[PDB]
Symmetry: D3
Subunit: 301 residues, 6 copies
């Protein structure tokens, strides 16, 4: 008969869940005529990632400041969940289902396999009226990072799951304009792998460990810096490398002068110290290193 997503969607829908948050937050006491605790209600979607432990990935902007979190399965069943870890930078959080039973976990695809022309579908709650599904394609890939897809709802709240035609997880859709869950015109999402890495740090550490690792250099134009080349100057100097932190790994040594980070020119030396320090461990960033030919990819830790 007619082609439809319903078939695969009926295999995926189980592993998607609706999250009902109740929390409190400190707010300014209203001055009139036109600090105190105010109760709010957040509402999102999430995916069951570990059927046995009852691990449910979700967005940090949903579960932030939560006092009580509840989970309802697509079949109607409700559970209590407990926080386990969040990550405001990438807007990802892990919750756990208290008393998990007959749970289906989603099968995660290798996000590295993604290409642009690929079809996707997004499952979530743009307007809070219940689980809404929409389709589209992989519009852009922050590497081949990040996933950008036209399969996203206008004026809607960045829902949860991003899925391929086989009904596997290729990512969690996110809101880039936090603390404002909305749209920029197109959908952004953390690829499924970044998601898995991110998620295991939360299970293991209560959070994702920041990998702020230069090595131990000295500004360009300084004492030990000006001494060397300075032919084709302008950039961030690197004096040492002995810490062996993806530096004896990045094939980097003394004297180098990095001036790139995935395209964007690294002006100052602190420019590196900051940009490479706010990223999540396991990250795959590329550094355009200056020394007459040099550009290696790093892996935090």
């Amino acid at each position: 008969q007619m082609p439809s997503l319903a078939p695969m969607l009926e295999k995926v829908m189980p592993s998607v869940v609706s999250i009902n948050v109740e929390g409190s937050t400190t707010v300014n006491t209203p001055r009139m005529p036109r600090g105190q605790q105010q109760k709010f209600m957040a509402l999102g979607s999430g995916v069951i990632i570990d059927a046995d432990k009852g691990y449910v990935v979700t967005n940090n902007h949903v579960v932030d400041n939560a006092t009580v979190i509840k989970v309802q399965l697509s079949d109607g069943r409700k559970f209590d969940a407990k926080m386990v870890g969040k990550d405001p930078r990438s807007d990802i959080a892990l919750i756990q289902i208290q008393n998990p039973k007959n749970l289906t976990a989603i099968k995660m695809a290798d996000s590295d396999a993604l290409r642009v022309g690929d079809y996707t579908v997004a499952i979530g709650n743009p307007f809070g009226l219940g689980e809404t599904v929409t389709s589209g394609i992989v519009s852009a890939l922050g590497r081949s990072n990040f996933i950008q897809t036209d399969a996203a709802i206008n004026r809607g709240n960045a829902g949860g799951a991003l899925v391929n035609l086989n009904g596997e997880l290729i990512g969690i859709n996110t809101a880039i304009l936090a603390p404002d869950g909305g749209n920029i015109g197109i959908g952004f999402a953390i690829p499924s792998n970044m998601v898995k890495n991110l998620t295991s740090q939360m299970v293991e550490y209560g959070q994702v460990k920041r990998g702020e690792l230069g090595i131990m250099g000295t500004e360009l134009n300084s004492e030990l810096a000006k001494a060397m080349k300075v032919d084709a100057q302008r950039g961030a100097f690197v004096s040492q490398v002995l810490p062996n932190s993806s530096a004896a790994k990045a094939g980097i040594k003394a004297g180098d002068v990095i001036t790139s980070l995935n395209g964007k020119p690294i002006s100052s030396f602190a420019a590196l110290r900051a940009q490479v320090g706010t990223m999540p461990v396991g990250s795959k960033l590329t550094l355009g290193l200056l020394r007459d030919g040099k550009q290696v990819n790093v892996n935090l830790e």
Copy 2:
């Protein structure tokens, strides 16, 4: 060759029509520096539903306050139409073609058959520049009610017809924010069946008959109400049932205490009287009834 909708679209396009409304409306006389009749022009789409009588379904927000309505077929032909019935609640209206000839009516699908993953396409006039077609999927179903689809134009005016891959009618797209024909981010529409039922009441009665039918109960906590259970109180009490209005049908009897209407908890007794009274006859609502197990679906009248 290449896959396209054009083929089926060429079978559906005939049954779609362009409606040109001209009407008058009472307006405030402008006060300056910065009641009277003002002439306006509304513009929509509609579907030929009965080829012989020349019945054309359309949106109430298009044909409301109309003095002269004209219809132009996709082939260029123009006819005069006459109103027959409208329904502001669901934003649906029926017009009739004066002198119908060589008309094609659309084949209506059973909307009950719809599932979420299904593909749809929407035909209409978002910006008045002529008949615009767009595609998408069934994003959400107010039952399996209402149809929500991503196949809807941003900042556009809720067009007319919603159609499956076989070129059958699965619904009429509507504007939830009346009297403002616009978008919320995604498309809403009355499923084709609700459409047909709605439409036949207009033909038969000049309007859709409201089925405001409780039975004849008494508030919870009252004289004849407090007398009974009150174990697990909090809700809307039901004293009688003899009227036999979907009550000797809903398997409901004296003593009951309804507290739901398709999910939303029924607080007061008038809360039922109102919510169940604004709906269209033939409706299929579900009542979470309290009496230690009870929840039956009703059918107005």
Copy 3:
């Protein structure tokens, strides 16, 4: 030396006070991503009207929903006050100082004596930064009602006291756009007399008694109405007058047909019933009565 208001202002400033309100109010629980009690703080000015009892007139939009109200005298002294009565219609309220001692009350002028060219000065808190004084003239008088004065602060919150050159009370400035304490461009205020009358009803009754008093007529065009004149029809008919409620006083009798209320034509019969029913007792409204010459002023009760 130089002319100044400071002199008289130093005689008036004592009788002006700063009110610090703390209250709670029911608010919607915030839905995110972007009922409960929320604490607010209101802030106004007021005038000591009765030195002995410690009566302080103020604006209802200041003391509304108040849990704790405090009063600070211009000399620094703070007292606790207790509500006694409010009146949202005119935005006037009466509070009482708990433990009043060495209080100065202001001398109230007869507002009836006011003419337009007269000078005024306004004392209050437009921006909450403390007691601000401004001058101007009587721009318009809702009779010679209401007082309109240019002596009002742009974008400011309708302060409290309105005062003449002798330092007497000619009125309390009010906000016409409640619940929004702001400006329309010019200042509105309840004349001092209306203020006094209003204020004594609060002391005496806990509120100002509404004087909704027609008499007992029948719509124009009805049974007992059409029977009479109908020459120069169009208006609100009056059948009876026996209730003697400012009707055996208004020189009104059976058959009359009122069609005015201080200028504005009285269309329907309920138009009178409403307009004359929302006003405060003691009011002085004028009724353009139809019967070939008739227009008398009434005094509620």
Copy 4:
């Protein structure tokens, strides 16, 4: 007793009148969902300028597009008025009272006598709630042109009359942002003399005659222009002067090169042709003429 404006105000109030306009205007037919004649109502103030003929000066933005204009005297009396002339440039218009009787005309002051520190008061209808009076001083004078005064209402509609302490007319307040009757922050007005001149052209000609009068020159850098000086060039050249139009009067002759008009440098030659051509006859503009010392004041016609 206390100082007040009421006294003089009671001498001026008679000569002020309230204008009630009713008109029609061509408007776009509304396109929905969201040319024809639409009826509006304008409302202003004006001053009786000629008691005998019943001449009432007012603002053009009040009486523009008027079908029926009515006048009500401060004592309550109503008359019908007829248009006589308007002038959108200065926003001034003259209406005539049909059947003038027991009229008081205002005594016009010589505006040339004005200085900045002088006190003024403004009478009008900022918000349509009736005749509102406000005070202030002469904030700026477009000569000593135009009158700018702080005696103007915020967010209000540029009322009518501007008056000194003796109750004489020093000007009519106007709206610079036509067709939007509002405030810029301070009040602008046509001085009383400009008003009188303007007004007599309307009586005499149905409008104010534009005095677009250069003489007959040739652009600077042209054939007959470059031939001469060109020492300290850059400006508008003047070839002839024989027309004797305030040129044999302005002491101007062949060869001149004007480059000023009351301060603003005259760039091109058409820059003069335009700026000096949109002004009202009788105007007093000053031209910074180049020829090594020359700057005379002109008087149109």
Copy 5:
């Protein structure tokens, strides 16, 4: 395996390029507190249309006012380009790659072959974050002109290329709201043929030649016009035709009275002179000619 666009997209991506403009523009000198040259940076997409000459079509709103334009191929390679021609009306421009080498040009489809149901995909830079691809269908065709497609990004900048399933060029997407590169809700684009014609005029003439060609008629109701029919008047008269400019071609002769231009009624005679004069040569417009049956399509020049 799974269906995807990536395959064909990998064949098309080469012929798409990223344009980095740097230009200057005259701007008003800022007045504070709150003419000069200001440097800006524009950014777009474009398609390699001629591999050998290195012709790259793009949008005029991207390359307008450009001082330096650079081109980067999808493989990373950068070239300098030089302007060759622009066309603000249709928002199309042609640039040339300086030193073109190993270039792939796209294969252009015949746009005339397009039908509505057809699938499309759009490639561009909505938010400047790099080349973004999105899909959709042919929503409307300004003939079967113009192409309207749902394959367009919300709040995005009208990207560049519009492509069918075979990876051929069916058009360049454009911004209708210039000089504001944004969305109306749906995508507009110049069909590929109009594109090719447009583009060859730029190569050949530095611009697209306007074909403002009536013939030589006289207004309806005039001397030589009223003389004839006037039966079913109201329109634009046509006196002559001898110029042979698509008039001895349009089968038009003396006496005619055109009153249409692709639907819109031609009111006046200048209405034709203007509408048919702003269009690009080679255009295919239709004229509803009055003479009791007549409507032929023209081809500029």
Copy 6:
């Protein structure tokens, strides 16, 4: 004759001047479709404070980022001025007239003498159309600090001079919402004395010296802090006083616990360090000191 300000205004107007600033500022390069130096023009008023040296006080938001500053006297004369010092905190700056000749300096009043009822007048350029004068009264005094006056223009740019009836300087009007020269509804200004002190630091030091002077204490609840009282805790502890910086002057000694600064409670210890550190030397702030009776006024340095 009639009362007016013109007389005294003619004595003050000379000492007021118009400042024409021309400057450059670093701005973001515009990204299109919708760092570099951009030229702007600022415009203000100022007062000649020292006739001989040609010292002209003005607002910092006028002369900030200035490359060329010009001064024009009320009589028309223009001079070049040079910066000497600015002070963004209070928005005050000092410029010097190059080649001062026949200058009149204004006579400064002792601001300490001010009371609220006093009359003021403000001279400046709200809309850039030239020197505008407005009147009013002293609405509030940040001590008897700061001067708040109703003598300020709506939506206008905080002009310059604030003057009493004798034509003496009582202050310079300022904009509290920098870098936005506008109104809050009422006028704020630095009293004339604060002005003089401020201004002499600029002459003497190129700027106003910040008097950030605690003494040398230790947080409350710390080692040397908890040791003492703690009876009626909650505040900022003070351990030492030996620095003799308005501490052996403020009658302050070891052990004290300050918790006020002109009304506002001093929560933390750094709360003092900051608030008392951003103020201008010579300041007169009051500290509510805790030790069972203690509150002395300080004088920076």
